Amino acid sequence: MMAIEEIAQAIEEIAKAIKKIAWAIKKIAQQKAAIEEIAQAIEEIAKAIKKIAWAIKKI
Amino acid sequence: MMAIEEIAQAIEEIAKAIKKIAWAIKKIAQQKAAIEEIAQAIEEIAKAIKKIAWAIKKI
Amino acid sequence: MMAIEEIAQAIEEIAKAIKKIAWAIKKIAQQKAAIEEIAQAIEEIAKAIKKIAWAIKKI
Amino acid sequence: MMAIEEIAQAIEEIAKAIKKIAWAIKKIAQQKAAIEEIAQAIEEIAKAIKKIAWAIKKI
């Protein structure tokens, strides 16, 4: 019970950190067209990882 | 039921975003021999992650 | 039994290696504001992955 | 049955591709002390991911 909830909470933290990485790569691309594509893909991965955390919560 | 299907759908989105990252690293390598090796490996990871999403669907 | 314990031990090793990556990116940022943000996010991911390993142990 | 075996096979492919990434980052570091640390950490992650694939096989 509590173990699966701990896993979901940890996965939520991972999604938040991956979104922070996407923003930083955006700023690197500003300082680039290919790097911007990487940052937008990383943002989509963060969104999907947050969806996984919620589904694990439902389990 | 619906939770495991949500996980598979999210993993499919992750594989699509990782394939987008592989293409972008390819274009960086054009702008490199080692970087091209990284892009080809990332493409194989995207292919394997999509296989994982389908197997989770079967579960 | 032993298989789930093996998975947790492997995930612990992954968290240790991700923390090593975060430190190395810190040193790259010293040699940078965006790169430092990436290193701090990677450290948080390592912390969360270690939490996942312990929860899998409890399972 | 077959779904869990498919997941293990896919995870084995991911470990092989991550080892290929580690070698490429090694060659980038040759072309660096921090980059070499990243490559050695990525190699350890590939080793751990292969251990996870085998434990999933045992499951």
Author numbering:
A (entry chain A), B (entry chain A), C (entry chain A), D (entry chain A): 0 to 30, 37 to 64
Q: What does the original paper state about this entry?
A:
Here we describe efficient routes starting from validated parallel and antiparallel peptide assemblies to design two families of α-helical barrel proteins with central channels that bind small molecules. Computational designs are seeded by the sequences and structures of defined de novo oligomeric barrel-forming peptides, and adjacent helices are connected by loop building. For targets with antiparallel helices, short loops are sufficient. However, targets with parallel helices require longer connectors; namely, an outer layer of helix–turn–helix–turn–helix motifs that are packed onto the barrels.
For the antiparallel α-helical barrel proteins, the seeds, models and experimental structures for sc-apCC-6-LLIA and sc-apCC-8 are very similar.
